[PDB]
Amino acid sequence: TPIESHQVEKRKCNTATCATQRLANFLVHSSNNFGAILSSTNVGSNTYGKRNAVEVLKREPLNYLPL
């Protein structure tokens, strides 16, 4: 196959790809806020108990046994 040309034509940040990388940087930058906010989940948003995943698992052993 022929070598790719060195022609480039960038464009304004209109594609979701641009934001995709923008939010990624903000994530590691807002870590403190994330932990601090989640820590106060007791405010009422504590209905995300991940430990429940294991509770239901044992409750439904079928998922483990052949279907």
mmCIF file of C-alpha atoms in Angstrom:
data_model
loop_
_atom_site.group_PDB
_atom_site.id
_atom_site.type_symbol
_atom_site.label_atom_id
_atom_site.label_comp_id
_atom_site.label_asym_id
_atom_site.label_seq_id
_atom_site.Cartn_x
_atom_site.Cartn_y
_atom_site.Cartn_z
ATOM 1 C CA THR A 1 0.000 0.000 0.000
ATOM 2 C CA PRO A 2 1.198 3.619 -0.567
ATOM 3 C CA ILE A 3 2.607 5.719 2.273
ATOM 4 C CA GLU A 4 0.104 7.990 4.013
ATOM 5 C CA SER A 5 0.360 11.674 3.107
ATOM 6 C CA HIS A 6 1.470 14.280 5.642
ATOM 7 C CA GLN A 7 -1.657 16.353 5.005
ATOM 8 C CA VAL A 8 -3.641 17.336 8.094
ATOM 9 C CA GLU A 9 -6.862 19.304 8.539
ATOM 10 C CA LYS A 10 -7.757 19.577 12.223
ATOM 11 C CA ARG A 11 -11.241 20.769 13.164
ATOM 12 C CA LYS A 12 -13.104 22.405 16.048
ATOM 13 C CA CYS A 13 -13.925 20.234 19.061
ATOM 14 C CA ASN A 14 -17.305 19.066 17.768
ATOM 15 C CA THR A 15 -16.781 15.304 18.075
ATOM 16 C CA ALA A 16 -17.423 13.413 21.313
ATOM 17 C CA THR A 17 -13.778 12.325 21.130
ATOM 18 C CA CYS A 18 -12.619 15.800 22.153
ATOM 19 C CA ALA A 19 -14.701 15.776 25.334
ATOM 20 C CA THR A 20 -13.834 12.129 25.991
ATOM 21 C CA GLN A 21 -10.247 13.168 26.725
ATOM 22 C CA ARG A 22 -11.276 16.400 28.455
ATOM 23 C CA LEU A 23 -13.358 14.635 31.102
ATOM 24 C CA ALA A 24 -10.647 12.010 31.585
ATOM 25 C CA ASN A 25 -8.196 14.643 32.816
ATOM 26 C CA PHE A 26 -10.859 16.200 35.037
ATOM 27 C CA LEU A 27 -11.499 12.807 36.639
ATOM 28 C CA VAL A 28 -8.014 12.442 38.124
ATOM 29 C CA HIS A 29 -8.208 16.159 38.932
ATOM 30 C CA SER A 30 -11.506 15.897 40.811
ATOM 31 C CA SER A 31 -10.516 12.744 42.699
ATOM 32 C CA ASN A 32 -10.581 14.616 46.006
ATOM 33 C CA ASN A 33 -14.076 15.919 45.278
ATOM 34 C CA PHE A 34 -15.194 12.442 44.206
ATOM 35 C CA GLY A 35 -14.056 10.788 47.438
ATOM 36 C CA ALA A 36 -15.247 13.648 49.644
ATOM 37 C CA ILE A 37 -18.664 13.635 47.975
ATOM 38 C CA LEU A 38 -19.052 9.852 48.055
ATOM 39 C CA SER A 39 -17.913 9.764 51.679
ATOM 40 C CA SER A 40 -20.980 11.841 52.544
ATOM 41 C CA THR A 41 -23.198 9.364 50.690
ATOM 42 C CA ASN A 42 -24.941 8.932 54.046
ATOM 43 C CA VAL A 43 -26.859 12.073 53.063
ATOM 44 C CA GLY A 44 -29.265 9.650 51.383
ATOM 45 C CA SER A 45 -27.384 8.415 48.310
ATOM 46 C CA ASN A 46 -26.125 5.382 50.227
ATOM 47 C CA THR A 47 -28.389 3.079 48.215
ATOM 48 C CA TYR A 48 -25.419 1.885 46.163
ATOM 49 C CA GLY A 49 -24.154 -0.724 48.629
ATOM 50 C CA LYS A 50 -21.833 -2.764 46.416
ATOM 51 C CA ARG A 51 -21.610 -5.392 49.154
ATOM 52 C CA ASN A 52 -25.151 -6.362 48.148
ATOM 53 C CA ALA A 53 -23.706 -7.892 44.983
ATOM 54 C CA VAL A 54 -22.418 -10.796 47.066
ATOM 55 C CA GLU A 55 -25.666 -11.018 49.038
ATOM 56 C CA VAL A 56 -27.793 -11.621 45.944
ATOM 57 C CA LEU A 57 -25.158 -13.905 44.421
ATOM 58 C CA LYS A 58 -25.522 -16.464 47.208
ATOM 59 C CA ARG A 59 -29.282 -15.937 47.078
ATOM 60 C CA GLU A 60 -29.249 -16.976 43.421
ATOM 61 C CA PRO A 61 -26.766 -19.885 43.074
ATOM 62 C CA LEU A 62 -28.442 -20.774 39.773
ATOM 63 C CA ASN A 63 -26.275 -18.232 37.958
ATOM 64 C CA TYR A 64 -23.336 -20.391 39.032
ATOM 65 C CA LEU A 65 -24.868 -23.779 38.240
ATOM 66 C CA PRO A 66 -25.430 -24.788 34.565
ATOM 67 C CA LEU A 67 -28.274 -22.970 32.816
#
